């Protein structure tokens, strides 16, 4: 079984006092706290074995390169990819989506084509495709939303045509916690000739993800949202497509020869999309966090998180004039608004009570405009949050409702 | 109406805790007169405060400056009112040369909240200097 | 004055055994070891105050945003830029040069123009400009090298012209240790209406740098070589030239708005080129590293490094058939070959003596080509390298020559 | 001539320390038959070996694989020699199915030195698989 006490024992920030009170971090969706294991992994790699990682000659460099490739293999086993050479290291889901849009996009989308996204999509899953459409001259069609935070799938027949090139969809929505039918939408997309990219920046930390079961052609996620360090993230690409995509950033490592009179040639897959010195410590920490989460078992995490979400949704009914956004079966996050009170005030107060929630548009403004609001308050229910923190949040919401 | 900078700082320091201070700010914002729907336009919108903010400045029948404001956020409107108080009954040059820093320091706002108020003050000072 | 014992004290890696023998890390030019100060700044930030940094409403988030911006100010004050808003966080010198070439290149370089590089440039300062000249159909021009590894400045007349848009030069060469005259090149390039980009990745860690005394238009450097964490790098740009450049990566935070019907509007400088979540941990560590170095004082470090370099050059005169590349007044690195033996074999034997030196083309194939060689060995004498390591290298080279 | 994998492993484990083992690799490289100037072309190049490595494989009159190579790095050439010794007198299927991991385990070449060796093994297995 799962024991949130032992788990919280490992995150040191969970001992901070925010504004004179013990901190209750409810913004893991914005970024997850890192256990002591990941901090120590990174810091130890730094202390007793740091060196360059470009197949160097001396022992330390070759060991560091081995370590980085082992981390890549662990990450490939995580999502269940066929080959470790189908995962590229990036800065995060944002840079991964940009890379896919520039590399694969600029060579696979032209004038007259069209790209399909959802109205719930994060800005990271919206802006790159807009830039691409503006560059090549393609159309961007949006999957509408239903009031309950789910996709109007019945509109799919009128959005996919012989010219649909890509479906960039979100796995778990970082605002509504909705989970889209990835396999079915992906089957429909593959029936037309349009690839599929999946933004799972929010889905990985809750349940197991199987890039071969979804058949998605691109999958992305960020490391700071998986209890690991920042600056690192994973972009999985089907080997078939990845072996044919040109290079994005240009420099050292990703090349095979560099001549000022005979041109330049590029290296094989994964590395061709990893210019300059990679974030070695970040990769060490990301592997450490992967090992941690796997040791805890994603299914126990998901069971605990679903029970905690049900408890919190039951408790938030005793808050008058609260308005929630998303389906009942949401994951990880609750978006809401306390009466006619602006989200900024609800959040400022909650934080003055030591409670940390995110307030505003959450890099998902089209969602806001759909919902006819200017902002929302999101709270994250991570694996290290307790029922007592849910009670503190309901308490703060009720006291704010009174005082306002 | 709104109290003067003297009574404002006094009644603020007289608050017993930070909750009372924040609620007093929300209230001060509540006191601000309603903004004309015409003035609630992009030409009068401010940016950088994380919430919709409109601040219109105009010289009355004299060289004196009159300020109207609004913000979709309660505490933001309260800060608008605090500013209006600090810049109350002053000509463009008097606003250009008035040091609001010691007032906020004696109110300790950057330590309990920080940049949106800075942006509002910058916009008001830009208007006053243009005048 | 300086004291290398107390300095080595802070480097845990400098107590590691390689192949059974005490390590002598002479590969800092590929990557510098970190003092426990940087490791610990990053670990403490992860342990006692981590949170997303997007001007979050809660205390941890606002504190973290202030920490990142204070590190940005420390960076701007290190190189001595006018404004802290004249610096952008990137992953490294490679990504920074790619960004300069894509944001500023596409709009300031048209067909018919010509860019000017040098024959000793790193690949990160060669590949981006080649890709750019391919995208816009411009001509790439090169400043040749003299036998002594110094630039043939005489050939500047036949290279600069009214179509010359940019001069991309390296402050110090990672292979020869040569230090090009940046001020005069920059004056001559500005007289031709050409901007100047300076890859100073090998210069910031040896002596003080002043982007106003040089007047360069763009400056780049990476932190993993600055004794700081990986995946973090500084791109300085002139405020005038920066506030006009279009945004490169698209995502969250770097947008003022994101409308699927009215287009996407951008946000002001630096933050316009910081898509998605920035490496907060890397940035904290880079602040720590800058603090440590500033404490040690670049002047004392340069004194000790020139002393160690002159000692190493005096002691290497007793190694038979040793060919060195570069001028006598080099900084940080010695590039050599041992007789006719290949670089890989010398490096391999040295490694098995505990001596970590790099072997290969050092991401500078045109340099290798100019020197009629297929590869060199490079040994870097950092601020923590002693005389004993110099003697060990000399002895190892002697033994390698006798045995081979 | 080059020793068989059995004699190779025996003579290598007979090495008292490591310098002898590295010079034995260097020598084994120095025993290879020279490479035709025609075969040292970009069509026979191997990447990831941190040195210019040429390797050619071809089936003779039978279904037997005949290998040749060269490297501008002595120890890389010795690795070429050792890989050739391990894969000697075999058809493409024998090459694909043969697991070479335990021989390296018995000679300890990744704990001493090994990624260019991985590049060589992968390229040879790719040629064998394309042939079978």
Author numbering:
A (entry chain B), C (entry chain A): 2 to 405
B (entry chain D): 3 to 115, 120 to 137
D (entry chain C): 3 to 115, 120 to 138
What are the paper's exact sentences on this?
The cysteine desulfurase, SufS, provides sulfur in the SUF Fe-S cluster bioassembly pathway. SufS is a dimeric, pyridoxal 5'-phosphate-dependent enzyme that uses cysteine as a substrate to generate alanine and a covalent persulfide on an active site cysteine residue. Due to the buried nature of the active site, these enzymes require a dedicated accessory protein called a transpersulfurase to act as a second substrate in the reaction.
Here, we report the first costructure for the SufS–SufE complex from E. coli. We obtained crystals of SufE C51A/E107C bound to SufS and solution of this structure indicated an EcSufS/EcSufE complex with 1:1 stoichiometry between the S and E subunits. The more open interaction is based primarily on contacts between EcSufE and the α16 helix (residues 343–353) of EcSufS, while the closure creates additional interactions between the C51 and R119 loops on EcSufE and the R56 loop and α4 helix of the adjacent SufS monomer. H343, D346, and Y354 of EcSufS hydrogen bond to D74, backbone amides of A76 and I77, and E21 on EcSufE, respectively. The remainder of the α16 helix interface is made up of nonpolar interactions between EcSufE and Y345 and F350 on EcSufS. The EcSufE residues in these contacts are located in the C51 loop (residues 47–53) and the R119 loop and flanking regions (residues 112–128); however, the loop surrounding R119 (residues 116–120) lacks density in both EcSufE subunits. These two regions form layered interactions with the N terminus of the α4 helix (residues 60–67) and the adjacent R56 loop (residues 56–59) on EcSufS, with R56 appearing to block formation of a closer complex.
